[PDB]
Amino acid sequence: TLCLGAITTLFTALCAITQNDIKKIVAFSTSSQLGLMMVTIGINQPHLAFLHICMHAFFKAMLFMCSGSIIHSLNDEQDIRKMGGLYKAMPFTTTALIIGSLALTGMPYLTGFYSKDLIIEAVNMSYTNAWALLMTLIATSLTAAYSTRIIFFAFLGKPRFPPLVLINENNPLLINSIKRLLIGSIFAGFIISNNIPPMTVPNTTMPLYMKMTALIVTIM
Amino acid sequence: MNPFASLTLTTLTILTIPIMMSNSNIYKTNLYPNYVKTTVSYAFTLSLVPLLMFMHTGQEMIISNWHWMTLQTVELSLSFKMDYFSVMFIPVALFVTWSIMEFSMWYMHSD
Amino acid sequence: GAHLARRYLGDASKEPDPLRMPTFPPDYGFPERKEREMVATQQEMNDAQLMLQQRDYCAHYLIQLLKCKRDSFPNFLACKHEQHDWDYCEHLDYVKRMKEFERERRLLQRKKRREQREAEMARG
Amino acid sequence: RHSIFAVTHVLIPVWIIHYYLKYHVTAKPYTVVERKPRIFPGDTILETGEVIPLMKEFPDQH
Amino acid sequence: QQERDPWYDWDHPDLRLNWGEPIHWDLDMYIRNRVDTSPTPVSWNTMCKHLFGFVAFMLFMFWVGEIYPSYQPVGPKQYPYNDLYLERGGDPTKEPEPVVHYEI
Amino acid sequence: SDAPPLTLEAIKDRVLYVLKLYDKIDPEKLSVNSHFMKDLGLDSLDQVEIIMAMEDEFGFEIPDIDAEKLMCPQEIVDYIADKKDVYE
Amino acid sequence: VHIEPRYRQFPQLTRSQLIQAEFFSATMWFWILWRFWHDSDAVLGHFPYPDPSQWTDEELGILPDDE
Amino acid sequence: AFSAPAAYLTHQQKVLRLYKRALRHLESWCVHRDKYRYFACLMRARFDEHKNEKDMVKATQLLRQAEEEFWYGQHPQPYIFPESPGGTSYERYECYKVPEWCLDDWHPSEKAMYPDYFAKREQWKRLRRESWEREVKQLQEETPPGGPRTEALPPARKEGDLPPLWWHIVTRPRERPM
Amino acid sequence: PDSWDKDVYPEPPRRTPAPAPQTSLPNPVTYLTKIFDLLVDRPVTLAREFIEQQHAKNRYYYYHREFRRVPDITECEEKDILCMFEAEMQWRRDYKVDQEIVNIIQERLKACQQREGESYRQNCAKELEQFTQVSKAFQDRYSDLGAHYSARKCLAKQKQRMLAERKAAKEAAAA
Amino acid sequence: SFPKYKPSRLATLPATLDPAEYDISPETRKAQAERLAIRSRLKREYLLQYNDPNRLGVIEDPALIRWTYARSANIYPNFRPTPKTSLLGALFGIGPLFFWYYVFKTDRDKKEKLIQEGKLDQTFNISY
Amino acid sequence: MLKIIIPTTMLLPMTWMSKHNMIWINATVHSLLISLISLSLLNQLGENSLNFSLTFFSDSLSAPLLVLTTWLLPLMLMASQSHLSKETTTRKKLYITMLILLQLFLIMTFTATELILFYILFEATLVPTLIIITRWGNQTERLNAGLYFLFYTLAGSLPLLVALVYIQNTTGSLNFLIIHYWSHPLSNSWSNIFMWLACIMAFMVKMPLYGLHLWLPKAHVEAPIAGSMVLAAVLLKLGGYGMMRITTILNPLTNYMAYPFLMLSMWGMIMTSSICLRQTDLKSLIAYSSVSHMALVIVAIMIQTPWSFMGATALMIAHGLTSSMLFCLANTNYERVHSRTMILARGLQTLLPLMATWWLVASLTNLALPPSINLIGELFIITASFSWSNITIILMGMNMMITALYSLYMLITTQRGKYTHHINNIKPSFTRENALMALHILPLLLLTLNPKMILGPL
Ligand SMILES: CCCCCCCCCCCCCCCCC[C@@H](O)O[C@H](CO[C@H](O)CCCCCCCCCCCCCCC)COP(=O)(O)OCC[N+](C)(C)C
Ligand SMILES: CCCCCCCC/C=C/CCCCCCCC(=O)OC[C@H](COP(=O)(O)OCCN)OC(=O)CCCCCCC/C=C/CCCCCCCC
Ligand SMILES: CCCCCCCCCCCC(=O)SCCNC(=O)CCNC(=O)[C@H](O)C(C)(C)COP(=O)(O)O
């Protein structure tokens, strides 16, 4: 199970970094996170895997909804090469997508942190296959890489869509749904972590560099 | 009678009502998507209570309500496990489904 | 890790084997050793239904934390002293395991070197 | 007309489910099994009234 | 059928067939819901080599990492009551060999 | 809702707008009936570029066999209107 | 809310959408800063990791290379 | 899609099709507009460098080399318009397209709604019935004795004629039917 | 309740701890359970009371059917069809009763596993042992008869096992 | 100049990479004209019935009938027992049967031998 | 059980005395009433069978089969009256007479207490089926089909007859109760081997066994719709019922005489499922589906365990209903377009939505979606085979993958895609066809609600 999860997360994160359809990128991201869950199961931490399922649901659904908002605004266009500067033209969608990407990369104290960070630390401190550990670290770097690809190509720079501009996200249904999922993606990690009984023994003592491994690889 | 079991069963049961109404004069009108979305939101709000009970006392259950059939020594019954995994996953899935249904009310408006 | 590089590249003879550890008697080098005591009774751990893996030598702090969490239910931010105490106990347990590992490494290297030196003296 | 949704979609189904569970399902053994509540030192039992003693004089590594 | 021109006015647009023209023996295999023989950007026999090399390399590396595992410099975890002899399956009428842990 | 109901006047306006932004065509000398080769003195490569600019403007592709035949703005407008079921 | 197409210009923006986006970005950053100010140990680690080499043989119980 | 194909493509047609394909794939590689404009001008210069080659054999050799280079350097994932044969919305609305003859099978209660629409439909059907035989006769006259050689159809030429074989072209369902 | 025998389906004495509030905040669980009581448990109780009142006005009984014991297949002559028929029916009834005994034991095992929670590996030893014994006996009696089983095939199986056991005992005696 | 693309069965050669369409003859042009003439004749014959206002039903296609008949009824009359046909029939109709028979017989013999020795761990094996 | 037999014999003159324009109404009404009466046979015991008399008895294995037969007669009548509208009154009455005689023969076959009476009725079912196929089939191949249907059966059943009479000279009886109570083992001799083969091959060719199945695609494709319904739903189950009856006297020879048939069944199940993937005729696909499911049933009967017998019973009932429904669904399209080629009419979901829903439900039951009784039977058989040998899960597993594929393939070919442009004669579905589909499908799910009624005597 551990080796299957490691190869899955690495291969899917490696495929995701060159894709041009936004739905394909998010789907490969989902597959890579499922591989990480399989890795977590493989190191005998099922409750951490369940917590990661619960954490990932929020921001993954929000990211897909933001992609759908972009697609509907640009006349059902899904190629990121034809999406230009939506940072100012689509402010709320930009905010939601940025928060979702930060949560997906395990940025501290967001929803994705409370599961992914612990998963990486548990993988580091266990008697495990070394190649699986290396592929897990490379995959968690590639996660930030493809998140950067999505943000950079979809929201920064100059427009690349057809000149008849129909960009409009002012609709209460879209705003309310995304706002609910955004509140979840900000606070659910803390709320759920502080309200469950501890079913696992915490890794209290670790070398400082191995405590910062996830953050460092994400930054690189 | 310890409302845990009744609430856990009702959360799942009320989700099937629009399925039974799919042959009434609400499936032919433009109010059906809102009706389904409201049903899902109510289900989420109801399911929030067994989660609170578990977070308070760690209460867990199994409910074997209907006996379907029995082989010679193997008994097959409709049974539901209401442990931590179920009572944690149900509200999350219901919340996500509520948000996505409200989103679909706008995304698939021309369908 | 540096221990992995030492074992896999250097001389694996003087490196402790995690699966086969320890190889020396617990009272080999020490004159006398205190027996590691336990605070929680088997019945208390059974009643608390901790886990088969949480029933370590820090189980009493975990039991206290669980009781405090149940008593302070709506205030899910009130069990900070108990959680900190349990974390400190687990940290001391991990430090003790590290001490055992270092003791095994030093004993292995010293014993091998002493045996080799005695044989070398006997070889002249 | 306003709050009739909470009656026909929550209250009636919960009435039916509660009746079915209270008077039919639990009329047979081992149909609703709950794992036993956790017991901690210093607790008092509701039925017997028995109290559970404390925990062996903590070494107090303050 | 995927290789046929999609900008032509076929009598059957989904099948990309014209009425009356001879039908391939294996048409139902080639209906484009199915086996596709269309030209690829990268040569066949080069996709195969890369895919097989990647798969074999990952398998070999997983084996190597299994026989050179990774771990922390710690000793085994210690459990109080004779490695919890009664908890992991009972047998309370055998008096197992005592398991003793000492302070350090 | 969705995009507005494109009309013939809008299509013609956008086609002429694209054509007057082409540096090889004089704006004043351009009319809706001007031939690309005869009136304007352009070659086949310029026509291919014009067809591609139309495709970018309207967000859909014109097949090569159909695109070869279009020679004046009126033919382009008629082809776009026929493709998109525009009747007003 | 009626927003009309623009044709090669920046689209029309309502004040509410910018207000909502700015508010939620600000609240995410405030939560990050507050949770780091109160729970720094969750990132930087809580307990000092010891260096095994600085453990004397007296407490580790190895004899002085004689017996 | 609308024009009848010829028996073969000419050299100029092949050159123009290669030019369009190369520019599209270069745009797929060059995502940004200014970079694409620069490299597209370079590609146009490279194309018209050999525009005045009187030797046809050398021209076809150059075209062959250019196509080999294109196949080597093509984008594996080029941009496709969403409704183009490779796009994400290629045949999305085909399930909503219903042929007009289905309206003949509506129950009279269904036809009781929309009276004016069905009166107009009856007028169109009468026109088609009155025009069919003249269309067939015109096709019989204009066709060469050894059968037709292309798929091109003639227009109407007489006083009140209609172009032959017009019904299924004129009564297309729609591009967005429902 | 009194619907089932509590010795056939036993349960532990059900010790549950008393509430020990340590916070000034109110308990949402208690407030919600009071609302659930007043809004759900009372109307259902009244409906059940009405239904039971109606039932009490019409009280009638059904009985468990009693079967006497007939001669077994061992006491039947080789071709005596009637005695064989009665013995085969008795054997089939006994087979069904044995299946239900195994079912009762399995129910006990499953209930204990759910009840004991995290301590099930130690606290369900007795139920596991009972199931092991019953399963061994049932497997000895009825396994491998196949489809088209009968009392005669069961008797042949028992005779074969008895012969093997007698031979093993006599061979161990000679040791 | 550039690395060459070589076709395969499941990834065929592109038209623009085909040498046959870069060295052409007037015979090839005549053949293409004949092909287009045949296609145009078939297209006219189909379209004449397709646009017929008095036509109700299915426009029968002789090509579809020929395809289905060739795939179903024309096969046995055109079959000859040859070394290739006989060898392929024997292989693909007999070899799998004996392969699976050997596998299953070996597995069941091993299981039976284990059962005779009394070491198979058949505890809790009640249903079969 | 004359309370079921006599009303069918009364259906006969009631049909022949009816007014010319009331034959279908009267036949359907009284057929449905007879089915309602036969519903009472489901009250079975746990120890022995319902021994009505010296001649007829009802078990927990034959009662669902009788209910299926009596329920299938009205559905056949409903499906037949569309394409027989142009027929003369006398020929319509003759067709209904053939259907009634077939029902009577099947009813008496499933309840006969003696094996020779069972044999006589089980051969008597041949004549009405052959007459129906060769007289009311549409194409010229029907004649050949009839011949293939006849001799394939008889070449199997003539040896059985000999064996039967031989057995009666040895044991003195062919009564099934006496045969069961006075059972004796079969020794390992050549004579016993050939007796086993004579007792087994007729039922094997009836299932049919892979390699002996060539008659089935011909007969089930060339037959009229009612013929195909009764051939797939009931007549294939004669082999399984007869095998489960006859195996009580074949032990312990079966222990090793089943190997060639087990290998044939498993590999040919894979083979026929694969054949379904490349089929141009829609009816032939359904026929090969029947072959695969019957191979599963053969494996279940051959391994001789209680779980396998329960699975075999459930699978036979479920397959009967599902295959009859699929044949009716294909017949609707055939009557619309007069062609059996699958790719001729496409995109039918756009033109006929409710019929598309019926297609989806039928194909879902074909691939054994849980908790349908199709899945229950398949899973019981797979579990029993796993106990027989752990390697079987490979072949069975492959089958589960292939079935769904071809099943969905069929759906995707007929309902999805775009409609054929030149086909303009697709009329809206009639009330009769929708009612036929509903009367097929609703009993399947109702039986899922209470599965112990189709699980057999084990
Ligand atoms: C297309 C599909 C049609 C339906 C399929 C029907 C399947 C029928 C296959 C019959 C299965 C087995 C039949 C007899 C059992 C054993 C056969 C023999 O091969 O086994 C050995 C037999 O030994 C030798 O093989 C002798 C037999 C050799 C002669 C038989 C001819 C087989 C050649 C293949 C001809 C094809 C037959 C089918 C025609 C269609 C066992 O050794 P032995 O212990 O001593 O014999 C046991 C019987 N005893 C105890 C009384 C002595
Ligand atoms: C367990 C026994 C079997 C295991 C599987 C072995 C291989 C099975 C081969 C299946 C053959 C089926 C033939 C008929 C299928 C229908 C035709 C079909 O599917 O069409 C092909 C269709 C079209 O291709 P697209 O890329 O989507 O292009 C469409 C856009 N233009 O694509 C498909 O669906 C092909 C799917 C076939 C998958 C076969 C390969 C899978 C092999 C799995 C092995 C790995 C095991 C994993 C182990 C996990 C660790 C425990
Ligand atoms: C993505 C990267 C891959 C792309 C790489 C592509 C590399 C190819 C670049 C070089 C290819 C060439 O120049 S190939 C050079 C071919 N030269 C000739 O054929 C000379 C004869 N002239 C004509 O045929 C016409 O003038 C015509 C030119 C058609 C103009 O058409 P019009 O005037 O009537 O509009």
Side-chain angles (χ1 to χ4, degrees), chain F residues 45, chain H residues 11-12 15 22 46-47 50-51 53 59 66 69-70 73:
Chain F
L45 308 149
Chain H
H11 183 81
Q12 177 231 60
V15 171
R46 178 182 184 182
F47 251 86
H50 294 320
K51 177 175 28 83
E53 228 63 38
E69 173 177 10
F70 168 83

Side-chain angles (χ1 to χ4, degrees), chain K residues 158-179:
Chain K
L158 285 173
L160 170 72
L161 174 62
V162 178
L164 286 180
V165 305
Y166 170 86
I167 283 155
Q168 214 212 26
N169 296 323
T170 299
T171 79
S173 194
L174 288 165
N175 182 269
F176 184 67
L177 298 170
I178 290 298
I179 266 164

Side-chain angles (χ1 to χ4, degrees), chain C residues 3 7-8 34 36 40 97, chain E residues 69 71 75 78 81 101 103:
Chain C
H3 54 278
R7 171 148 172 247
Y8 298 147
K34 326 270 306 194
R36 189 175 185 185
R97 295 175 55 192
Chain E
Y71 51 84
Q78 276 172 358
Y81 296 97
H101 309 299
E103 286 265 347

Side-chain angles (χ1 to χ4, degrees), chain J residues 50 55 57 59 107-108 128, chain K residues 259 307 388-389 421-422 424:
Chain J
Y50 184 36
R55 198 215 90 249
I59 298 179
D107 177 279
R108 282 180 60 75
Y128 63 108
Chain K
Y259 271 108
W307 272 64
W388 188 81
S389 180
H421 292 148
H422 62 87
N424 55 3

Side-chain angles (χ1 to χ4, degrees), chain J residues 11-24:
Chain J
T12 48
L13 183 83
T16 62
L17 255 52
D18 198 26
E21 61 112 341
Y22 281 108
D23 186 280
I24 57 194

